[PDB]
């Protein structure tokens, strides 16, 4: 069981507090939690969310105008038939909604794994085994400057190794 | 010193939890997948170029008071084949003291505003004052043949052969002459002076083409006089009444023969005329009739019969003060493939009482737009595969299907947060 | 020294990107999931072991010149119940100067090549020269009852009671005798010397079995003579013409009674014979007739009526030089459950003009294969739930459905490379 | 952001050059990129692709001959019905195609994870946190021989630690 | 290729022996295999299976009472229609069955990843790169007590690091 | 020393491999997703509150021996409008020497046990001994109008106007008087004394309401006497027989006029009565008839005609010894919207032979439960969208569909083990 800061897989209910994507940090076996917005990582996520929404749009266009051109000249009723077709098409719409939600969800999650990779790539000493979407770094080695570069994308003075 | 950093997701304030397969999804707002489309009242067309209309005075571009007088726009009116005071029925039977014209054109969709000029008001009494039944049956056949044709044209003359014994007639209740379609001809017969006549034989030839117009089927009127009795006919003719239409082979295709059929009249010394509607193919036909009366048809409507297609029929009635019948309405409603357009408010024209109606304008406005479906419930040019409820039986185009908005899927919107495996939602 | 090694995926030259749910997929080639099946022209059968045929001379295995003469294979011909010069109609009515045979058998699917031996050429005039209507109506009923039966047999004998007063008939236009189904019997009646006869009463019993064959419904012909008038009959009789068929209870089920119905003939002093087709259940029936003529039916077709099943009817026409009717075609096309097989080139035989047609052989070739569906558009023994377009209404088996190749899914082929997450494709 | 050699999740467009599965290697802060065929690992991938294709074959056969055996004797038309059934079945085919493509894709990716596991298992020094489907090894410790064994499946002289 | 003990992704056929979930352990470069029952997280796995089954129940109820309330007064036959609707609905049931099995499967696998995380969390010395759902520990550092705590959840005397 | 630990999955003994999309799944047991529902024999209702019944002596709560005598429960009987010896037909025509009752009520579903009290046993002979056809046709119309109405009531009296010339009749074959629906009236007319009467004219007014009951359509019986011939009528009347029913306008809507239609009887000096069933809307109607006979209808059934709904009709036949007809059965089976409940075993009562049948009780047992669907094949209160096979054509509610148990999906149960990658299953 992890404590007051938990991984990227997790989503916590914070109904009357800070929401969205945020950086949850605290000392290992020491000082309390600091929470602050991730809006510099979000620039990636946000653009991918647009790409995902583009997929949605397409898939919706793809369900528009699917029934072929009619020329009914006869005056007799087909409502009971149209009804049975509607009941089927409604069922189909249910399924593809659940399928779409999962596919979107998954693809969104994979864009959070692109942040991991980039942040890990930014400093070699940032590579460590902790909890899914959590990392451990040392403030003796890296100050605000390099931290601010590493995960807040502000490119200030990278970490020195000697 | 060692500090632990975590990329946290937190959901706040308003949020909806969309359920899936392979994880769920949180979103802060949500909206419907498809907006239900509506069938707009009035008349409109698909493809906006494969349609043609047949007009009157309220669709005539040469009318001096056009804009005011018009129940349509100028844009719309251009696709019409109009003429002020006109009517298909007036050109079909050509009654004396009324306008004559050559209605014709081609198209997938045919639009009619025919009827008002030969309503009870029009006052034709060529041995028949109540034209409504004839009008109805004529219209029914026009609509019927039209929703199965691509091209159509009026035929105001044909090839004929008349026998020298008979000479052209006239009737005082038909103004100063007689109709231009059933052509009257008689010989001199007096029963009292024993100046009895000879039965007539006359020919006529239906043409397979009329200019560019192709005639696969002709709509002709077989007419005859209905006499009250033996004696009544025997005032003016020695034998018995009869008028009969034969084919090229020699079979009979229409008429009335009172040498064998009883006298059914109820109009006294003067007879009453009945015109039955017949659909005839091109060829050389013949007619036979009693000495005192020959009624040869000399006009018809020519149909190419090439393809099925929509037909719109507008309720052609008068303004306040001229008696109107519902022949148009009735005829459409008893034929398939036509859509009837009718008024829910009285006819109140701008130009005069009978021209430029407010209602008719807010109905026939759609004819300037390109619809993606047209139905007896109305038209739609907007996309979306769904609508609130089923459209009335005859309809053409890309039909929307019935659905309830409350059952339509919802799409996540605003801020979206993905759920993962079992770990994902803490409480 | 530290060296970094990566397992890389790279895509090259011809490649297609197949879209999915849970990642996409690259492939170098791609092909369709299902191939559209085609219906093959000709006749074939389902199950290839529950079918039976009724034959002629071109399906006859005992024909000396068989291979040449045959419109079928040997394999196919073996399931037929044939006989050179045969015909169901010839065994049904048994006219003198023609063959006589006992057609019978059982099966889910019945195949007919019946007709050619009693076409206008065949020359039968037992008071009726144009047999076509009788032939047609007879065939129509045969097809009808057969597509609703498992077993069927000809019935060439039955139990009867004839009264001593009448004695067996003969006719000069029926060669030297009379038919083997309506049996003629007469007594002396002479109006000139007032030697008048007695009306006849005769009985007959339709059997519910015929050996192994089960008879739940019999197809019998009720026949009678049509005279021009009173006076014409009254040359040879003192009463009026009549022949009527009663049931076991005592109701009438068919015939003609000119004691109450007017004389309808047009053949003068000699009458013309009419045979109406009747469907009768097994039992003891009776007949009544005028002194001078008794026409008792002595044959019928017996049907078990157990189950519905396919019927194939082949257009049984002559080779060039012998006049043929379209009774077969017409009868099939006006009864449900049968499929008609008809030629698109003239009948040209090898053996002689009328036997062993090229076309017919490559059409009835299918009858040796086991089809998975058979339709009026052809047969198929090949798999796949799809076809280019719809097959004609009567069809049996596992039907393929209409579909366009352009919408059929494509399956990856060659080199396949999986796409993963959002990282997956660089450019 | 990884450089000229990137993980197994990745697929790069190399339209005029080498495609398929290949070993992309270079030194950390040194010697340039070397790319060479993975056809010794492919024997696994390829074999799993056959197993995947077996699944496909089955699933296609499972969609053959679905509709019941008819015996229609009536001459009346059913085209409007055949049409509506075809439109529905066409929709079903669309869905199960996208579903199949993902399932195949996923199972194919999982067969690349068997290579990782096996290569990691072959030598202890091969176990290191790098990039998804990338590993780091030392050329002082392991020569061509053991490398050739480790990831080129040629079983030549395993790595010595003392 | 791992030897006689293999990861959590794996499942092995053992018809007449021990089955279910078990702890498979052995010395690295030495001693025999020890296998023993996992009957304590199985309430966790199992409990999560109940939640999964709750999903199933729901989804099954969602397929019950689907068809509209009829009032057919006519004596006309609709069997040919009922057939075509049944064949379609049967196809739909096929699809959602395969979808349900996978979704359940996946969510079940992810509950085995909650155990990993928790066991890793229990002792710092448990964090090591081995095989999916396998770990390595040292018997000179942690005795029965702490082992019994770590993965048999007995809460007995946790590992001493000094 | 380093020790390697692994969390292993091993599958044992009995197991099933459930195949999916995104991993497969092993399970030790497996069971069906849905269970097929069955229709239960007898009658039941939807909603168990929106229904009403019309009863006899076996549904009567005031029956002294009720539990015994009852073919229904007490609970079920509460929804009935009953009366021992009663019948809809007995209140419709009111024959003398039989019970009379005001049947009425409202409901979505109407349940009839009508019929037994006017079966051949009852021996009514008011110029007609065989009531069966009248009974049948009356029931047929009752069922028709009832499956299209929400409320219904008997109308036992109406507004009338009779002319002073005629005074009320009586008949010895109708006990001591005449029926309470066709009311007989006559004047002195004697042809032999040359005292010839005058034609009758009488009026009547059908009420558009009957208390709370709304009457939009009335079911009335137009009756008349059928005489054999001229001579027979001419014993008792100077003219010719006639009884005719006119509307308010002056159109005739039914009856028999032998001044213009030939005589058709077969009962000699005494005539035989025919009663045709007519459906009439409220208003002021008139009748005309021959001097010697006036037959004014004075009763009818009133229907509100508001909405369609189920109708159950139970086969109302006698115990042993009393002659019964199948009018009920026949009438139901020839009208849509009703479901017939019939007995497979003879009627054997507890109380006496005619009341409290074993079978009937276990059939009408369902009427105490709330069904989720009701059909002509039986009822069901249990859920599940599937059944072994199709339910008979008329059915109401949430219908189950036909399916085979072998084609229903299987759900894993017991011990479940997930498969993941291609690594996952070793052997
Ligand atoms: C859940 O929490 C998120 C934070 O992660 C909320 O986003 C924040 O919403 C406020 C809403 O007013 C935004 O403030 C507004 O900013 C605009 C300028 O962009 C300004 O014109 C307004 O007056 C106001 O200050 C805020 O910017 C936004 N955060 C980000 C990163 O844009 C989110 O709205 C919450 N959910 C719901 C349903 O509100
Ligand atoms: C589909 O048809 C609808 C109407 O049924 C079209 O909407 C109408 O579009 C016209 C222009 O084509 C708009 O006309 C303009 O009206 C404004 C406002 O008074 C005026 O200032 C302009 O001079 C002009 O007349 C009209 O506003 C609009 N309808 C409504 C209700 O606003 C629509 O464009 C059609 N779409 C397609 C793609 O065919
Ligand atoms: C995409 O690139 C791959 C390379 O990984 C292509 O595969 C290679 O295709 C060539 C085509 O000529 C094959 O070459 C042939 O090799 C055989 C021996 O196996 C030899 O006898 C021939 O003369 C020729 O050199 C080669 O085998 C094949 N690679 C493998 C591993 O089999 C692939 O074809 C490319 N995509 C497309 C669409 O071409
Ligand atoms: C596959 O192997 C598993 C073991 O992981 C089997 O579970 C075990 O099944 C036995 C069946 O007899 C259960 O035994 C019973 O134990 C109760 C006490 O709990 C005892 O009173 C009974 O007399 C009996 O011995 C055992 O409890 C159960 N394991 C657990 C943890 O409950 C499983 O049944 C095997 N598969 C099949 C198809 O049997
Ligand atoms: C659906 O209808 C069925 C019948 O078709 C109902 O089943 C019956 O339920 C009653 C209780 O409501 C059971 O009655 C009890 O029977 C026992 C045992 O004989 C007796 O001791 C009690 O005094 C009482 O009579 C009855 O057994 C049962 N039928 C069967 C075959 O088990 C069911 O209740 C209905 N459900 C709903 C929700 O409408
Ligand atoms: C399930 O989610 C998939 C994403 O995880 C989705 O595919 C979408 O994402 C891919 C990239 O991985 C897009 O491909 C690119 O699209 C951009 C433009 O948006 C191009 O610039 C680029 O060349 C490339 O084509 C897909 O286009 C995109 N999907 C759509 C429909 O646009 C899957 O589509 C989704 N599954 C379903 C059935 O919707
Ligand atoms: C595909 O599998 C999903 C699980 O991987 C499944 O969702 C289910 O699991 C979530 C938790 O991640 C449940 O959420 C909780 O449900 C419990 C009650 O069971 C509540 O107490 C709690 O507050 C929370 O809502 C989902 O409710 C649960 N699903 C259901 C229907 O209960 C997906 O449903 C599944 N997809 C399909 C279509 O079956």
Numbering used by the authors:
A (entry chain F), D (entry chain B), E (entry chain D): 4 to 165
B (entry chain E), C (entry chain A), F (entry chain C): 1 to 427
What does the paper say about this structure?
The lipid-enveloped influenza C virus contains a single surface glycoprotein, the haemagglutinin-esterase-fusion (HEF) protein, that mediates receptor binding, receptor destruction, and membrane fusion at the low pH of the endosome. HEF2 is anchored in the viral membrane by a C-terminal transmembrane region and contains an N-terminal hydrophobic fusion peptide. HEF1 forms a receptor-binding domain (R) that recognizes receptors containing 9-O-acetyl sialic acid and an esterase domain (E) that functions as a receptor-destroying 9-O-acetylesterase. In addition, N-terminal and C-terminal segments of HEF1 combine with HEF2 to form the membrane fusion domain (F).
We picked and averaged subtomograms of the envelope from spherical virus particles with a matrix, revealing the 150 Å long trimeric HEF at 9.2 Å resolution. A comparison between the newly obtained map and the crystal structure of the trimeric ectodomain of HEF reveals a dramatic difference in the overall conformation of the molecule. The map and the X-ray model show good agreement in much of the stem region but the maps diverge in the head region where HEF1 domains are splayed out. We applied flexible fitting of the X-ray model to obtain a model for the in situ structure of HEF. Comparison14 of the in situ model with the X-ray model shows points of flexion in both HEF1 (residues 33–34 and 408–409) and HEF2 (residues 65–69 and 99–100). The HEF1 head region in isolation (residues 41 to 371 of HEF1) behaves as a rigid body and itself does not undergo any significant conformational changes in our fitted model compared to the X-ray structure (1.0 Å2 RMSD). The HEF1 head region rotates 20° clockwise (viewed toward the HEF2 stem) and its center of mass is displaced ~7 Å further away from the three-fold axis toward the peripheral density of the nearest neighboring trimer. In the outward position of HEF1 observed in the in situ structure, the HEF2 interhelical loop remains associated with the HEF1 beta-sheet and no longer interposes between long helices allowing the tops of the central helices to associate along the trimer axis (interhelix distance ~12 Å). In the in situ structure, we identify prominent elongated densities on the surface for carbohydrates at N-linked glycosylation sites N12 and N381 of HEF1 and N106 of HEF2 that further validate the fitted model. The in situ “open” conformation of HEF appears to be stabilized by HEF1-HEF1 interactions and the splaying of the membrane distal regions is required to mediate the contacts.
